[PDB]
Each structure stands twice: as structure tokens, then as C-alpha cells.
From a paper:
Here, we report PET‐degrading α/β hydrolases, including HaloPETase1 from the marine Halopseudomonas lineage, thereby extending the narrow sequence space by novel features at the active site. The enzymatic degradation of polyethylene terephthalate (PET) offers a sustainable solution for PET recycling. HaloPETase1 is a salt‐tolerant enzyme and depends on higher salt concentrations for the degradation of PET at elevated temperatures. We propose an extension of this PETase classification system by type III PETases that include HaloPETase1, 2, 3, and 4, as well as PmC and dsPETase05.
The crystal structure of HaloPETase1 was determined to a resolution of 1.16 Å, revealing a unique active site architecture and a lack of the canonical π‐stacking clamp found in PETases so far. HaloPETase1 has the canonical α/β hydrolase fold illustrating highly conserved spatial positions for its catalytic residues S156, D206, and H236 as known for IsPETase (type IIb). There are two disulfide bonds observed: Db I (C64‐C126) and Db II (C273‐C276). While two bonds are characteristic for type II PETases, these are, however, located at different positions in HaloPETase1. Notably, we could not observe a disulfide bond flanking the active site, as it is known for IsPETase. In HaloPETase1, on the other hand, we observed the non‐conserved aromatic acid Y180 in subsite I (equivalent to W185 in IsPETase), which might form a π‐stacking interaction with the substrate. However, instead of an aromatic residue at the equivalent position of Y87 in IsPETase, we found T88 for HaloPETase1. Thus, the so‐called π‐stacking “clamp” does not exist for HaloPETase1. Further, we hypothesize that the backbone amide protons of T88 and Q157 are responsible for the formation of the oxyanion hole in HaloPETase1 since these residues are located at equivalent positions as M161 and Y87 in IsPETase. In contrast, HaloPETase1 has a distinct and extended loop (loop 3) due to an insertion of five amino acids.
Residue numbers in the entry: 20 to 287
The structure:
């Protein structure tokens, strides 16, 4: 949380990659947003103007929970877009293999590399993260093996079925912000998340939110919204103010009794 600008009604300085600073990770940011279909089988939520002020936009690829669509998560996806991310959701309700998510990344790469178009030279292909809920959180871990996925944020992942291959957990490309809810009886954290924490080959920040059901991530994603935004702003925008959300002995979530935190490979 620590920011030299002091937040609030002040004006926090730009991030390391040049994106506007924000006074809150849970409130929407300064970019007006739009959404629409992308490549037939994806849906994008993005700033309505891309590439202003010399910026190249980081990307979050999203996988839905079982039975769900991108609209089920429109609040959280629009929220990230309002901070400056280009957010691409696989449309599928069956995101567990990770392949649809990676196809959405391939699609945006093509568009970035065109001479003209919505995305032409406007994306930062070195700053891609993955996130998703439920089976889509398992799919985030599956997709997170790919060398282009810099960090992941699985929201209540389901890893005991629905396309998951648990060996993916030990083949991640980058660090993981693993989120669970203590009231989640559908993707039991003991069965679905504890094994990921144990076997992951990367640093893991595992936060379990007290009193969160399996439906906390739907819509605007509740009390996961701010933390997930901090994670992606830190790693994909070099927002230094998000560092002490996760790192150090006195990190924000570490001293917040609403969270049970288990870390590995994270400076503490």
C-alpha cells in the first residue's frame, strides 16, 4: 500500500511503466473502458483509447468459472481495464485446459504485430498475466506454464478435475497469487489449493479470505478485487506501491486478520 503520493484525494505518481498511479486498488481507475468480441471466441475489456501518452498496455487473460461467461465477471474485468490493462477473457465456460486462454494471447499477439488496427504496436507483450475463477483458475495454472505468462492469479482454483493436469503446478513460468475462501465448499482449499502451494515450482503468495464463498469472485469479485489488482499492477506495471501488499514481514495482507497468508519464495 505504501505510496509517496499519499493516495486519497491526492495524485499518486505514475508507475514504472508509465501508467497512472491510483489511490485505491479496489476502486476503478482513470481509463474510460469499452468491451466487445475479440477473435470470435474471446471478449475484451479495455481502455477505450489505447496507446495514448506513449504507453504499451499490459494484458490480463481470464478464464471463467464452470458454467460461466465473461459477463459473469464483467465487474472485475472492467475494473482491471479501467486501470489500463487490456483484459481478454476466453468466452468458454470450460477453461480448465488453459488452451482457450493461450489462444486469446496468440490472437492479441497477431493484432499487436499488424501495421494498423485496434492493437497495432499498442500492447506490451512482455507484461502478460493470467487469472481466472474455479475451473478457470485451474486453467490459469495450466496456461501459466507458457513462457509468455509472467504471473498468475488463480481465484479459488479447481484442480481436482475439469481438465486440470496437476503436473502443470510444478511447471509455472512465474509467481502465483493463489486466492481461496474459507467458506468455499465447492473448490475446497484443502483439496484444490494446498497441493498447489506444496508443489508449485515458483514463488506463491497464498491468501485465504475469511468468510468468502466460492461465489466471491463473481461480478466485481468482492474483497479479491483490490488484492488481485495490486498483484497485477506490481508485476505488470511496476507499481511500487503494491510491493508491500505482498512482500515483507509487515505486508498489508500479512497483518490483515481477515486473511490467512501462506507464502513461499516471497521475500518476508
Amino acid at each position: 500500500s505504501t505510496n509517496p503520493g499519499g493516495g486519497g484525494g491526492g495524485s499518486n505518481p505514475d508507475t514504472g511503466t508509465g501508467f497512472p498511479g491510483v489511490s485505491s486498488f479496489s476502486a476503478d481507475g482513470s481509463f474510460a473502458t469499452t468491451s466487445g468480441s475479440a477473435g470470435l471466441s474471446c471478449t475484451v475489456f479495455r481502455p477505450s483509447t489505447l496507446g495514448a501518452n506513449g504507453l504499451k498496455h499490459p494484458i490480463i487473460v481470464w478464464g471463467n468459472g464452470t458454467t460461466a461467461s465473461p459477463s459473469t465477471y464483467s465487474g472485475i474485468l472492467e475494473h482491471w481495464a479501467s486501470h489500463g490493462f487490456v483484459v481478454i477473457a476466453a468466452n468458454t465456460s470450460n477453461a480448465g485446459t488453459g488452451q482457450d486462454m493461450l489462444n486469446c494471447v496468440d490472437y492479441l499477439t497477431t493484432q499487436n504485430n499488424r501495421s494498423t488496427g485496434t492493437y497495432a504496436n499498442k500492447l506490451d507483450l512482455n507484461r502478460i498475466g493470467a487469472a481466472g475463477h474455479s475451473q478457470g483458475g485451474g486453467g490459469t495454472i495450466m496456461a501459466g506454464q507458457d513462457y509468455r505468462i509472467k504471473v498468475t492469479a488463480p481465484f479459488q482454483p479447481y484442480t481436482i478435475g475439469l481438465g486440470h493436469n496437476s503436473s502443470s503446478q510444478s511447471n509455472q513460468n512465474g509467481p502465483m497469487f493463489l486466492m481461496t475462501g474459507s467458506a468455499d465448499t465447492i473448490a475446497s482449499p484443502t483439496l484444490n489449493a494446498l497441493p498447489v502451494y506444496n508443489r508449485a515450482n515458483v514463488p506463491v503468495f497464498w491468501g485465504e479470505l475469511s468468510g468468502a464463498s466460492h461465489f466471491e469472485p463473481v461480478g466485481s469479485a468482492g474483497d479479491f478485487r483490490g488484492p488481485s489488482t495490486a498483484w497485477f499492477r506490481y508485476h505488470l506495471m511496476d507499481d511500487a506501491s503494491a510491493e508491500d501488499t505482498f512482500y515483507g514481514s509487515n505486508c498489508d495482507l500479512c497483518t490483515d486478520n481477515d486473511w490467512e497468508v501462506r507464502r513461499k519464495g516471497i521475500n518476508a
